[PDB]
Symmetry: C2
Subunit: 102 residues, 2 copies
């Protein structure tokens, strides 16, 4: 069961994390592109973008089946802070933190 308030603030937090992931992605790309010397470095970068882009396209799934798992992943990846989950029910917060610890 998800309240209106929970679903709405979760969406806002998804977008926030999404923007954080863009910033990180850009920084790494911008970095390992300036560190290029060999050409295979350029193909490694290409492979990285291809992969990270496909990951992101489907990472922010708001469906009831995985939405809890998604937050755990975001938390583990540092894309959201635990303090940003306090709009959720206590049981959801605990479950998320737990999954992310492992």
């Amino acid at each position: 069961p998800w309240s209106q308030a929970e679903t709405q603030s979760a969406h806002a937090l998804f977008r926030k994390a999404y923007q954080r992931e863009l910033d990180g992605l850009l920084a790494t790309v911008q970095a390992q592109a300036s560190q290029i010397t060999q050409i295979d470095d350029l193909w490694k970068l290409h492979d990285f973008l291809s992969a990270k882009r496909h990951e992101i396209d489907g990472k922010y799934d708001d469906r009831q089946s995985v939405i809890i798992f998604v937050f755990a992943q975001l938390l583990k990846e540092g894309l959201v802070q635990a303090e940003e989950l306090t709009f959720l029910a206590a049981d959801k917060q605990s479950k998320i933190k737990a999954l992310a610890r492992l």
Copy 2:
């Protein structure tokens, strides 16, 4: 049909052109990367890499039955100059310059 020196000097220019395209590909990527401002710029870079890597994968066919068409494409693209084809038989040069206009 094909001189032994023709074949050597052909494989050479062929490989010299490959290294020229890489030089230009690398220069463009490093430039695009360091000049990113929006996130869409990053997606453009990705699409550009995707396209060129494909184009390149199947452009450089070293096989004797095709080498003439490749040189034409390279000449048409500006990756080699007509002046660099003088080591070939007169009939081979003309053939190439003709195919380039297709």
